[PDB]
Every structure is written in structure tokens, then in C-alpha cells.
């Protein structure tokens, strides 16, 4: 009867080991990605040619306005991408459907491309997870890989580093990881906004719209 704890311990050891190996391979993959991008851009410069990189496939979008005075279409889209509070943030996979959904809500959000370090620190610092049985979730901070394994293990994604990988690269298990992840509740920016009323792309100071790579500096002071 005492053998059950022993086998549980050994399978936990095995899980820790292949999680370590998976994380190491993820790190190699990130480094190789950066190296190949740099070298390929260098080759494109050397030849008389152009190199356009792929779109990042993942957008971090944070709400900017409150819950009052919104058109019903805007409210429906906000419900669909789980942006319910004024400073909520979520990950969205980028395709034509989600891009069109984001277009109708653009003046009320700001979004961009999260990059690996900000994805990791978002998960580590503000990462909360829906634990309970379906429709009874009971948000809990991660603090452990046990619940990640319990709910998402069947996709071979037991581990916060696996979650980070699946989020940073729009991996085969992205919808599941995103849905498992509670919507991020962010604090106001450390140095404040420019003007929530105006677009980021307006020549005057403004905040809403697609920030592209500039979302990271904002997340860092909103975190």
C-alpha cells in the first residue's frame, strides 16, 4: 500500500526531467530563431534584395476604457476576447477573424507584439489560472506546475515554461493555454498614459491602436 507514494514520486521525477529537457530545447529554439533572423537579414542586405519577416501571430491586447457607454457590438467583442475590466490584458492569436474582431474594438484597446521576455514575466508575475471543473474555475496564482499538469497535461504542456513557449510561438496548443490562463489584471502604467482618447498613430500624443513592438515598454510599467 506504501508503493503508491513511491511510484507517484518517481513519475513526478520523470515529469520534472522531461520538463527540464523540453525547456532546454525551447531555449535552443529561441536562440536559433534570433540567430537565423539576424543572419538572413544580413544576407538580404548583402544581396540587392529585401527580406520581409513573418507577422508575430500573437498579439497582447489590453483594454483602455471602462464599462460605461459602449456600443453593443463593442461589448460583445470585449466579452468574446475576455476583456471585461478597464485594465485587463489577454493574448489573441492573429488571424483574419480575430483581426476583424479587433478592428471594431480598436479605439478602446491598445495591443502589440509581446516578445519572449515580457511574455515570460507576464506569466511569472501576473499569471493566474482557472483551476476548478468546467464553468467553476476559481482563479488561482500559478505557484506550482501541479494544476498546469492536471488540466493541460494531456497536451504534453505540463509546465509554466511550456505555457510560455506555446504563447510566444503560436503553437499547436495555444487556444487551450490561453483559455486556461485567467485574464491578466494589470495595474496602471508607472509613468501614466499619453492620452487614452487619441490613437497611437496620431501625430499628437495618443494611446489606442496597434503599438506593434512598443507594447512591451507599456506592459513593463503596467506590470
Amino acid at each position: 500500500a506504501a508503493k503508491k507514494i513511491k511510484t507517484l514520486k518517481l513519475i513526478n521525477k520523470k515529469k520534472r526531467n522531461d520538463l527540464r529537457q523540453r525547456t532546454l530545447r525551447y531555449e535552443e529554439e529561441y536562440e536559433s530563431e534570433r540567430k537565423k533572423i539576424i543572419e538572413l537579414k544580413r544576407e538580404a542586405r548583402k544581396n540587392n534584395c529585401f527580406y520581409r519577416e513573418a507577422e508575430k501571430k500573437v498579439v497582447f491586447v489590453i483594454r483602455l476604457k471602462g464599462v460605461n457607454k459602449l456600443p453593443p457590438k463593442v461589448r460583445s467583442v470585449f466579452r468574446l476576447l475576455r476583456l471585461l475590466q478597464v485594465h485587463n490584458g489577454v493574448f489573441v492569436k492573429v488571424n483574419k477573424a480575430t483581426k476583424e474582431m479587433l478592428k471594431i474594438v480598436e479605439p478602446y484597446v491598445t495591443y502589440g507584439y509581446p516578445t519572449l521576455s515580457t511574455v515570460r514575466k507576464l506569466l511569472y508575475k501576473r499569471g493566474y489560472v482557472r483551476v476548478g471543473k468546467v464553468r467553476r474555475y476559481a482563479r488561482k496564482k500559478i505557484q506550482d506546475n501541479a494544476d498546469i499538469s492536471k488540466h493541460l497535461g494531456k497536451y504534453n504542456v505540463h509546465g509554466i515554461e511550456d505555457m510560455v513557449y506555446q504563447l510566444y510561438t503560436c503553437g499547436p496548443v495555444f487556444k487551450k493555454v490561453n483559455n486556461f490562463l485567467w485574464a491578466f489584471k494589470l495595474k496602471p502604467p508607472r509613468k501614466g498614459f499619453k492620452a487614452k482618447r487619441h490613437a497611437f498613430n496620431e501625430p499628437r500624443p495618443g494611446d489606442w491602436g496597434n503599438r506593434e513592438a512598443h507594447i512591451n515598454e507599456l506592459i513593463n510599467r503596467m506590470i
Binding site: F50, R52, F200, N201, E202, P203, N210, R211, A213
Partner: protein, 180 residues
């Protein structure tokens, strides 16, 4: 480095192309350098101009390059002539203005400030055409011509701008604006 002194206008070189279709196989590639706070604003302006001059919009187009041009000699002073199109409260006008400073970005920031101060022309009403270095021989505006004398010197009649620490409220005796 002094961030208070530093503006945040930068020059961006942007190259784009319509998505190839069945109708045309090799669309001509459009290239332009513009001035914006950041590369995102730069790309937005590039696509705005693509739509305005060509019949090409963001949806049917793709980026090919977006880099930042840095001044080769950020500490040499050079004269810039910038052509300009802006719309007023009652019409649209072209004007040519001259500046002189180290970087084209600084010249453009000067231009935006001057337009706002003189003609109340907001940045949304401004379209920069053809900013380029000009030699001292063909400088046209007198306020730039007078800055290219063989030996330039003048006094420093500006009032002192002391530190907040030494900007004390009660003074023991009346300070002198005469200075020197």
C-alpha cells in the same frame, strides 16, 4: 545624454509593395523615407501615402523594409531646406523653409514647432516633401544667411536659468541681468 533636451523625431526608411496577384506578377516596389516619433507611426504614414498617391492600401500591401536612418555626423552643423505642403483653415499652401542644425530630425522638429507657432498648423495638417541639405551659397532665408558670416560673435543677453536647487525664493540683494 539629456532627455529633456532630446526630441523624439526620427527618420525612417520604409519600403513596401502591393501583394502580387494574378493580374500583375511583380508589382513595382515603393520606397520612401519619412519622419515620425517611432517606426509604428512611420509605417502608418507610409501606408497613408501609399493609399493617397498610389491605389495601394495596407490590406493589399506588405512591408519589405523599415529601418531608421541615423545622421552620419550628428555633431556637424548643416543647413537644411525643406519643402512643405500644409493646409490652413481656408486652403492648402506649399512653402519652403530653411533651418540649420546637426540632424535632419532636429530640423524637422524645428519645422513642426515653427509651423505650430506661426501658422497654427497642427502636425496632422503637415506633409513633409523633400527635406535636403543645402550649401551655404544658395541659402535663401535671411535669418539663415546672417548665421553664415566669416566670423560670428554676439553677446549673451539671455537671462540666467539656474538650477531648481539655487533658484531660492528670498534673495539678499537684487541680482543683475547685466551679467558678464
Amino acid at each position: 545624454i539629456d532627455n529633456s533636451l532630446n526630441t523624439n523625431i526620427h527618420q525612417y526608411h520604409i519600403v513596401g509593395r502591393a501583394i502580387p496577384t494574378a493580374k500583375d506578377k511583380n508589382p513595382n516596389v515603393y520606397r520612401m523615407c519619412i519622419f515620425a516619433k517611432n517606426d509604428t507611426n512611420a509605417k502608418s504614414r507610409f501606408w497613408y501615402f501609399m493609399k493617397k498617391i498610389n491605389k495601394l492600401k495596407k490590406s493589399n500591401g506588405e512591408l519589405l523594409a523599415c529601418e531608421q536612418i541615423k545622421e552620419r555626423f550628428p555633431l556637424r552643423v548643416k543647413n537644411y531646406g525643406v519643402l512643405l505642403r500644409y493646409d490652413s483653415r481656408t486652403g492648402t499652401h506649399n512653402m519652403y523653409k530653411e533651418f540649420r542644425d546637426t540632424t535632419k530630425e532636429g530640423a524637422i522638429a524645428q519645422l513642426y514647432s515653427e509651423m505650430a507657432g506661426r501658422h497654427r498648423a497642427r502636425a496632422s495638417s503637415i506633409n513633409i516633401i523633400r527635406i535636403s541639405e543645402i550649401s551655404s551659397s544658395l541659402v535663401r532665408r535671411p535669418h539663415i544667411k546672417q548665421l553664415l558670416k566669416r566670423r560670428l560673435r554676439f553677446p549673451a543677453l539671455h537671462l540666467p536659468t539656474l538650477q531648481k536647487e539655487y533658484r531660492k525664493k528670498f534673495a539678499s540683494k537684487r541680482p543683475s541681468t547685466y551679467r558678464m
